[PDB]
Design a protein around this ligand. Structure first.
Ligand SMILES: C[C@H](CS)C(=O)N1CCC[C@H]1C(=O)O
Ligand SMILES: [Zn+2]
Ligand SMILES: [Zn+2]
Length: 219
């Protein structure tokens, strides 16, 4: 029996959702996601692994009087995009980078309805920003920045302890992308990784260090 979906407040207008799956060859993997509230509207940062969890997550917010305005997926893997098919079926707007959509189509998965290309994208002006630091954990990975709180959702890019599965990784690119991310978001109050506990800006440094080590052990 896996743990039930968890929803907890991280900051004003910000909640973290945690979902769990048994992953072949990796054991039980926890996935952190965010829900960001603007007025009476709610935005999903990453979907839980499954439609069932995504439906539960949406319901929890709908019950509390919020309209689900949009969803954004950090990268193509199912821990970020699992709910897209369901969200699309409910006509709830879904967002991903053009690269992520290309990779999804490739993986035989349902694509986000809306896509953006380019480094910066403001899902909500002045409140939610998507940033692409370049290839790392995957070619398409992006981070989400909340300026009003200085909270960065690292997603699966942030890897303090180990890089994890390198199957889709760009090992050569990653240290450079990490350096770029650290320079841009060193100011961050909080960093929320996908697969590990919430932390301060130091997670950016650790990720860069891990990325360099991985490339080296790699040579
Ligand atoms: C469900 C995730 C996809 S990012 C996964 O398989 N793993 C494998 C180990 C932890 C985590 C990771 O690569 O970050
Ligand atoms: Zn991944
Ligand atoms: Zn992941």
């Amino acid at each position: 029996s896996l743990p039930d979906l968890k929803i907890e407040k991280l900051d004003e207008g910000v909640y973290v959702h945690t979902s769990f799956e048994e992953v072949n060859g990796w054991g039980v993997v926890p996935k952190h996601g965010l829900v960001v509230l603007v007025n009476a509207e709610a935005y999903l940062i990453d979907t839980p692994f499954t439609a069932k969890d995504t439906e539960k997550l949406v319901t929890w917010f709908v019950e509390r009087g919020y309209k689900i305005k949009g969803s954004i997926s950090s990268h193509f893997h199912s821990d970020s995009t699992g709910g897209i098919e369901w969200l699309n079926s409910r006509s709830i707007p879904t967002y991903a980078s053009e690269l992520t959509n290309e990779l999804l189509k490739k993986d035989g998965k349902v694509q986000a309805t809306n896509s953006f290309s380019g480094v910066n994208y403001w899902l909500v002006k002045n409140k939610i920003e998507v940033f692409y630091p370049g290839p790392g954990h995957t070619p398409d990975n992006v981070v989400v920045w909340l300026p009003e709180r200085k909270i960065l959702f690292g997603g699966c890019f942030i890897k303090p302890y180990g890089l994890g599965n390198l199957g889709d990784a760009n090992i050569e690119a990653w240290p450079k992308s990490a350096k770029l991310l650290k320079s841009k978001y060193g100011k961050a109050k909080l960093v929320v990784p996908s697969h590990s506990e919430v932390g301060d800006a130091s997670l950016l440094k650790l990720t860069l260090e891990q990325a360099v080590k991985g490339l080296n052990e790699s040579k």
